[PDB]
Structures are given as C-alpha cells and as structure tokens.
Design a protein around this nucleic acid. Structure first.
Lengths: 182, 182
DNA sequence: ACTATTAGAACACGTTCTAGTGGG
DNA sequence: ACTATTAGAACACGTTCTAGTGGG
C-alpha cells in the first residue's frame, strides 16, 4: 500500500536522523538503518538507491521542515540575512553529528543524487533570499543569497572537521555578509 | 632508504593522479594505486593512512606546483582576482575526473586529514590573496580571497556533478568577485 | 637485533543477488 | 498472474592483519 510505503519512507529517514545524531556519517550504516526501520536492506535500497541519496534526502526534509516553520525580525536586509545565517548556523550546531552525516553526504554526492542535492541547495537559497527581501526577492538578492549559501556550507564544513571553531565560523559568516552588502 | 621512500611517495601520488585522470573518484582504488606504484597495500597505507589522505595529498602537491609556477597581469585587483579565478577554474576543468576525485576527497574528508585539507585551503587563499595585492595582501584582501575560495569550491563542486555548466560556473564566479569588490 | 616491505588472507560495510513469502 | 517485501548469502572495495622477506 502507498500509505504503508510512505510510512516506511518516513521510518527509514527518521531512523537515519536518529542514528546520525548518535554517531555521525560513520554510524549511518545501511544495515543499521534497515534494522531500526524494520525494513529489508533490499527495501531500504528500493526507497533510496544509495547511502548518499538517503542522507541527502533526510537533509532535504530537514530543511523542508525548517523552511516550513520559517514561512522576519529585521528592519534592514543586512540584519535579516544575519538573522537567517544565525538561525541556521545555530540550529545545525545543535546536533553536530547529525549535521556532520547529512552535510558530508550532501557535499560528497555525485551526479546520481544531483537532483536531490539541487533541491536542498535551492531551498537554502530561497530562505536566505526570502530573508533579504522579506518576500519575493530580487535577482541580486538571490545572487547574494547564493554566495552566502556557499560561504556557510564551506564554513560549517570546516567546523564539522574541527578545522574551525564556532567563533571562527561566526566571524567568517558575519564578514561574508558584511562585504556582500557594502 | 629515505631517497627510495620519497621516490615511492612520488610514485604513489603520480599513480593516483594517473588513475584519477582516467576514471575519477570511483577509479582511485587502493589496490590499483598500490599496483601502479609497485608497492604493497600495506606500504600504500603506511604512506597515506586512507584514500582521502591520499587524494587530498595529491591535491596538496598539485596546488603546490601550480602556486610554484604562479610565483600578475592586471592593473586592478578586480582584474587580477578575475585572472586567478579564471586561471584555476580553467585549469581544473582540463582534467575533469582528476579534479573530481581530488575535489570530492578534499570536500568529504573528516578531522583525520584536517591538517592536509587545511594546508590546501591556505594555499588557495594565498594565491587569490597574492593576486589581489600583487604581494603581501591586506587582512580584508585575505578575507575576500577566503570567501572567493569558498564560492569557487562550491561552484566547481556543482560542475563536477553535472549540476552546473561551465557558463554557469563562470557567471557565478564573476558575479561573486564583482559583489565582493563594490 | 630493526624496521620497511611484500603478497595475500581477513574483516567491515556499501551494494547486489537469490529464493521464498505476503499483500492488493 | 503482480509486485513489494524479507533474510541472508554474495560481491566489491577500503582497511587491517599475518607471516615471511629484504635492506641499512
């Protein structure tokens, strides 16, 4: 049934977030996800043809949910963008290893998951973009939002690998947005 | 001997670049690298404790060599930065699958290779930074160079996965540098 | 006595395959 | 007749281990 099929898609991704929150990218093992979901490994692959597609699908729905709750505080597009980069940078650091697994999956994917990846990318831009205009944004506002998305993925990626501290990431984010709004 | 040891380090990485140029990240197989280098898999791991450390070491020495040849054309720091982002963006597209293997390795590494990764990152910044000042750069010039490094890794990463075309990558690069120099 | 190296078995996990079973 | 699902064997490759060998 399609209702049960949807139910085990949600059970598979919910399992993925549970395991990733506990042990990161190295703990999201396909057999363990298919266990905690009570599905066969063959089923788990039927729903997600790879590990990468799995975790970037879970990132897809995480950012989808966060955008849903996000759809404000700021009289300047500068302070609004700072508010979104602070909201998301703050949240992704709440579950460091869940963030690690999903972000590394998103960043190491190849063309096979391009679609999924692209979707996530778009969403993030939209958020930052909708932060700046407080609505339907400009072309230049989607541009800046795009570059900022890059800078945040780069910095978040550095913090996932102990290459940067929370203070370093905050510095480079505030500085990126400050130079992109001259 | 240390001379022979160095010789097989160079043979291992040269093998890595050869195989990656032919078949990308999925073709850089440890057994195949240890074959083409005439070393044991146990030796290959003695020199590089993982696949990731291997290919990001090869990226380390690729960017080291490119920086060595780079160490100009432009009366404006804008046109100089455009010249470096064009030089590197142009070169990395000469061997698309070698670029794919090394860039994905650099982007999917964890803390174990952080050092190596960090080194590469620094080098790239330096290049862009030295492009702008035409020498010892400012703090703000290293800043902009840093953000541009992010934007280029992001875009190059999108082009490696058929998510963006060469024209798209060129657009977003020129636009990033144009908004970072207002 | 030392430590690097080698060929290969061995192990882990991502992915696929096989045969059998259950649900619409 | 259909197609999803299941448990598990099977295969590939990254990584480690074992025993034996070579070089300073």
């Amino acid at each position: 049934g399609s209702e049960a099929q949807r139910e085990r898609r949600k059970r598979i991704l919910d399992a993925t977030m549970a395991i990733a929150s506990k042990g990161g990218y190295e703990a999201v093992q396909m057999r363990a996800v298919a266990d905690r979901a009570d599905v066969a490994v063959g089923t788990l692959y039927r729903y997600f043809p790879s590990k990468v597609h799995l975790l970037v699908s879970a990132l897809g729905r995480e950012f989808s949910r966060i955008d849903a709750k996000t759809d404000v505080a700021g009289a300047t597009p500068f302070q609004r963008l700072n508010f979104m980069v602070g909201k998301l940078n703050r949240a992704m650091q709440r579950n460091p290893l869940l963030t690690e697994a999903m972000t590394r999956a998103y960043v190491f994917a190849d063309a096979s998951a391009a679609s999924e990846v692209d979707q996530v990318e778009k969403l993030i831009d939209s958020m930052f973009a909708r932060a700046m205009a407080n609505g339907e944004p400009t072309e230049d506002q989607y541009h800046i939002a795009r570059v900022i998305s890059d800078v945040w993925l780069s910095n978040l990626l550095a913090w996932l690998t102990r290459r940067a501290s929370a203070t370093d990431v905050s510095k480079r984010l505030d500085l990126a947005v400050r130079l992109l709004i001259g």
